[PDB]
């Protein structure tokens, strides 16, 4: 298994995971440490705590990233280079910033770092989704997770050691910038699968538009060359609704023939442009306009910039069959791990009665090493074994690890038993993490992997966010061993939903494409409307939260609004999930 690591792609994946992980701890945790040694609350500023929301709400930033292709490098690589450049500049600026004058804009710069870091995460996740082959998806996710954890470790756990010694905060931040530099260089060395039939067709149309000025001929030749390259590139690509019909199907034969005719017309136009001809070129250009008004609309003869730039990822994802089943699976697959890690610290402090320092050291060392090793082992099992079966095994192992936590709670206190049990739990957590990131990368349509991956990451995090309270209420009501038994039984539904959607998962693994539901008659649109209403209610509640935070006016009904919005949203989700299961059942027979 050393061969994959010997390949440079593993190295670039590791370094980019490091690049993504570095700003997370520096943005908040290291900043909490700096404010704590300064004794500053870092609250009431109201610019801070946007840094936490920046990662959560990255799916709002994503559509510009999946829509826009930077002129330098490619879409993924160019956005990555840009985002790392802004991060490096911002960290260097904060290091340059002198607290001697005032706090000035430390919180604003932290929010800028958080926005640029959520941006870089989006772009790295998209680049990792597209660049990684299907069987390599698991191992690449494992390496990315390893680099991510290592970045969090250096920015969060080496930060105190470095700051307490001679290096100081200014040099610490500039050294983080320097460690970001080879991430930028390696991003330049990173591969780029720009692909994108939509992007190639948009280049085709942009150059055709700059060619409608065909009286100057100082631009028609170059623009026609760009059109020909884009058309040749888009001919070998696959259009939407035809991705599953890859091996020379009649539909893709018509696609290829249409692009054959198109590139022939670019041949004629370039023949006339190379002559330097004005009049003949213009006559055959009017004929070209007629033929494009007659022939070439067959496959996506449309512009690219649209509201769709932001709607198309969601439209596609929801258009896929078993979309809501996958939505719920993403939400509650890591539910057991969220339950365990939410209260592991307090359980070790009180439930098993360990000393705080012992718990801190054993967690910091064993949990981190176990998550890393589980990530690697999960990835190697992923390249060995299919996605669905590996997710099944790793979810079952997550449940049995929570069962090990129940063993710990019932069993008398021992450092060694706690060590082995927490190592097993974090081992299964790392394996499930690698398999889950692989699943996220599998689900993205790659055409817009940034937006769909950001949606799925927010989906995974929404479970974790709501986990904390329910775990606290459960432990206070029923105790710790009963809580961990329920933790196992709540990790079960993720496995159950995986078993439900195993047909879709195996289909996607083998064909690399998704079915789009043809079963929609009236109910699917109803569930989509329910979700849209839930999202609008969430946005309105966020506006109310801002109004309450500014404290000009406050209305107590916002809590009920939250509960009602959650009820409607989950109602839509379950309705869609039941429809999705019914559609899968219909496809089965």
């Amino acid at each position: 298994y050393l061969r994959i690591f010997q390949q440079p792609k593993s190295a670039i994946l590791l370094i980019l995971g490091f690049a993504s992980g570095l700003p997370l701890a520096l943005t908040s945790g290291t900043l909490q440490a700096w404010m704590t040694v300064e004794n500053i609350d870092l609250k009431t500023i109201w610019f801070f705590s946007l840094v936490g929301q920046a990662y959560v709400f990255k799916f709002l930033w994503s559509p510009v990233m999946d829509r826009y292709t930077p002129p330098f490098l490619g879409r993924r690589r160019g956005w990555l280079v840009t985002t790392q450049i802004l991060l490096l500049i911002a960290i260097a600026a904060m290091g340059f910033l002198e607290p001697g004058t005032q706090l000035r804009w430390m919180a604003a710069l932290a929010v800028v770092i958080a926005f640029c870091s959520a941006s870089q995460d989006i772009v790295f996740d998209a680049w990792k989704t597209d660049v990684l082959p299907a069987e390599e998806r698991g191992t690449g996710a494992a390496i990315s997770v390893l680099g991510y954890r290592l970045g969090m470790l250096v920015s969060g756990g080496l930060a105190l050691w470095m700051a307490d010694k001679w290096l100081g905060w200014q040099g610490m931040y500039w050294l983080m910038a320097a460690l970001l530099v080879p991430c930028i260089i390696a991003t330049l060395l990173a591969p780029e699968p720009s692909a994108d039939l939509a992007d190639n067709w948009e280049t085709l149309n942009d150059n055709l538009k700059v060619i409608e000025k065909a009286d100057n001929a100082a631009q028609v030749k170059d623009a026609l060359t760009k059109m020909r390259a884009a058309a040749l590139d888009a001919q070998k690509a696959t259009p939407p609704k035809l991705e599953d019909k890859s091996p020379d199907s009649p539909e893709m034969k018509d696609f290829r023939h249409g692009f054959d005719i198109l590139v022939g017309q670019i041949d004629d136009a370039l023949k006339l442009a190379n002559e330097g001809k004005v009049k003949e070129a213009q006559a055959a250009a009017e004929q070209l306009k007629t033929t494009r008004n007659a022939y070439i609309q067959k496959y996506l003869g449309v512009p690219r910039t649209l509201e769709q730039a932001v709607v198309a990822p969601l439209r596609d994802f929801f258009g896929r069959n078993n979309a809501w089943l996958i939505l719920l699976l993403i939400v509650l697959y890591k539910l057991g791990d969220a339950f365990a890690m939410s209260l592991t610290t307090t359980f070790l402090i009180r439930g098993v009665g360990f000393d705080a320092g012992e718990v801190g050291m054993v967690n910091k060392t064993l949990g981190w090493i176990a998550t890393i090793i589980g990530a690697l082992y999960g990835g190697v099992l992923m390249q060995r074994l299919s996605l669905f079966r590996a997710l099944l095994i790793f979810g079952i192992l997550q449940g049995v690890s929570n069962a090990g936590y129940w063993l710990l709670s019932i069993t008398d206190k021992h450092l060694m038993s706690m060590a082995v049990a927490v190592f097993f739990e974090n081992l299964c957590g790392g394996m499930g993490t690698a398999a889950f990131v692989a699943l996220l990368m599998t689900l993205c349509n790659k055409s817009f992997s940034a937006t769909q991956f950001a949606l799925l990451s927010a989906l995974s995090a929404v479970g974790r966010v709501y986990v904390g309270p329910i775990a606290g209420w459960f432990v206070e009501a029923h105790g710790w061993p009963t809580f961990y038994l329920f933790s196992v039984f709540a990790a079960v539904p993720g496995i159950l939903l995986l078993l439900i959607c195993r047909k879709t998962l195996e289909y996607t693994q083998q064909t690399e494409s998704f079915m789009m539901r043809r079963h929609f008659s009236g109910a699917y649109q109803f569930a989509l409307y329910l979700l849209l209403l839930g999202c609008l209610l969430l946005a309105l509640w966020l506006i109310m939260l801002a109004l309450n935070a500014i404290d000009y006016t406050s209305f107590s009904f916002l809590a009920g609004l939250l509960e009602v919005a959650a009820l409607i949203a989950i109602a839509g989700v379950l309705l869609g999930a039941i429809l999705d299961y019914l559609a899968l059942r219909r496809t089965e027979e």
Partner: antibody, heavy 124, light 109 residues
Framework: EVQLVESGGGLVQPGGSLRLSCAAS????????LHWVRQAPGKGLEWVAY????????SYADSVKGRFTISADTSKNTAYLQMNSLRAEDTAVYYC?????????????????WGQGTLVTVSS | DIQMTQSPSSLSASVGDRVTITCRAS??????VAWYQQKPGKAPKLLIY???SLYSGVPSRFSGSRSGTDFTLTISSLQPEDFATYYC??????????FGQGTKVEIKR
């Protein structure tokens, strides 16, 4: 079973201007566009010109435009490159390669068959 | 005819050693890049067309790959007869068909 033999030697005045004949055997001259590629002694290849006998299309390099004229005789299945106003760096080996029709794999097989080349040179 | 500056200008690899020669197109040329092997005193031979593609029964020692505008020709198992001059030729635009630089090295032995 095809080849592009290039010739043209004969009784001609030295220090003038000569045309390079590229006889195509095993395939019609109209089915493949013939491109003259110039390899100067000591440096790499450089596409000099091309003719598309199917439609009469013709193109040249920037360094040879206005002085060269590439034609093609479909009757005898051969191409020509009448090089005029030859200059010191015009000396090179001229391989008449072929290049298929678009659309299809013939186009993607760019220069799938070349010719042994003729060493055009200026001397005494 | 200007690319990025590289410390190695030529290629020299042992027999049986996998070696790669790469050139980056100025602009996107799609998969329309061909690789030719020209032994001295002989016309170039089309090794790889479409920058990765080859038919059945063709030599399999030579391989090609493309990522964006970057094209790489790799020889899996280098052979004594492999030593020649390799040209990367984008073949998209007729009037500006561009080629490689050159590689003049004896048979590494």
């Amino acid at each position: 079973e095809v080849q592009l033999v290039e010739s043209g030697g004969g009784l001609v005045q030295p220090g003038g201007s000569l045309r390079l004949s590229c006889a195509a055997s095993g395939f019609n001259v109209v089915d493949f566009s013939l491109h003259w590629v110039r390899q100067a002694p000591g440096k790499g290849l450089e596409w000099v010109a091309y003719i598309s006998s199917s439609s009469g299309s013709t193109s040249y390099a920037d360094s040879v435009k206005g002085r060269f004229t590439i034609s093609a005789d479909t009757s005898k299945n051969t191409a020509y490159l009448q090089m005029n106003s030859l200059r010191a760096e015009d000396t090179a080996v001229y391989y008449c390669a072929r290049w298929g029709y678009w659309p299809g794999e013939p186009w993607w097989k760019a220069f799938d068959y070349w010719g042994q080349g003729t060493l055009v040179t200026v001397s005494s | 005819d200007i690319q990025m500056t590289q410390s190695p200008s030529s290629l020299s690899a042992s027999v049986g050693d996998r070696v790669t020669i790469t050139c980056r197109a100025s602009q996107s040329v799609s998969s329309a890049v061909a690789w030719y092997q020209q032994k001295p005193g002989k016309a170039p031979k089309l090794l790889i067309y479409s920058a990765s593609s080859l038919y059945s029964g063709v030599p399999s020692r030579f391989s090609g790959s493309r990522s964006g505008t970057d094209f790489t020709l790799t020889i899996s198992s280098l052979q004594p007869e492999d030593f020649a001059t390799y040209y990367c030729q984008q073949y998209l635009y007729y009037s500006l068909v561009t080629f490689g630089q050159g590689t003049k090295v004896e048979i590494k032995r």
